[PDB]
Homo-oligomer: A and B are copies of this chain.
Amino acid sequence: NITVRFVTENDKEGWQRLWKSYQDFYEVSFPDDLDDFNFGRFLDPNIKMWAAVAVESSSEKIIGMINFFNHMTTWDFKDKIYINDLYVDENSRVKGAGGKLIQFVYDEADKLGTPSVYWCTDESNHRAQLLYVKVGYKAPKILYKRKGY
């Protein structure tokens, strides 16, 4: 039994742990400051950027993390929520985290008046997509980024 909740200052290590692990799985290394810079935005009630954690109820251990935020849209008056990061514990298979995390965001999104939630992954990632199809649907869109970015 997993347990999803918003992060507290005392969750900075459990989250920061996964954060580095998430940088590993993805082959990236962000400046050492970003950790704080994000956690700040996560805690400040004015910055519409949240982070949640999946804590193992039977051991008080931080399993997964989910970072999301708000942003406008020229379509519709209501803003939308983007799940920028999602990373469950690499040392445990067939639990429930990620499913429970994606749902927490759905719930918190509904209360905010911005129910429209979205995210993306690598086409190659099939393990994660087993879930995403249960909780969402693959949009027939092709993402395009500026060269060098």
The answer on a CB contact under 8 Å between B120 and A132 is no
Q: How many copies does the complex hold?
A: 4
Of B74, B120, B142, B145, the residue contacting A38 (CB under 8 A) is: B74
The answer on a CB contact under 8 Å between B41 and A72 is yes
A13 within 8 A of B: no
Residue among A84, A136, A141 with max Cβ neighbours from chain B (10 Å): A141
**Residues on A close to B: CB < 8 A?**
28, 30-31, 33-34, 37-38, 41, 47, 49, 67, 69, 71-77, 82, 84-85, 106, 109, 115-127, 129-130, 132-133, 135-149
Inter-chain CA distance A106–B38, complex, in Å, is: 26
Residues of B within 8 A of A143 (CB): 118-120, 138-139, 141, 143
Residue of B nearest to A117 (CB): B146
Shortest Cβ-Cβ A-B pairs, 7 listed: A71-B71, A126-B126, A117-B146, A74-B84, A139-B143, A116-B149, A118-B145
Q: A115-B149, A126-B127 are in contact. List 7 more A-B contacts (CB 8 A).
A: A33-B77, A41-B72, A121-B141, A121-B142, A137-B144, A138-B144, A139-B143
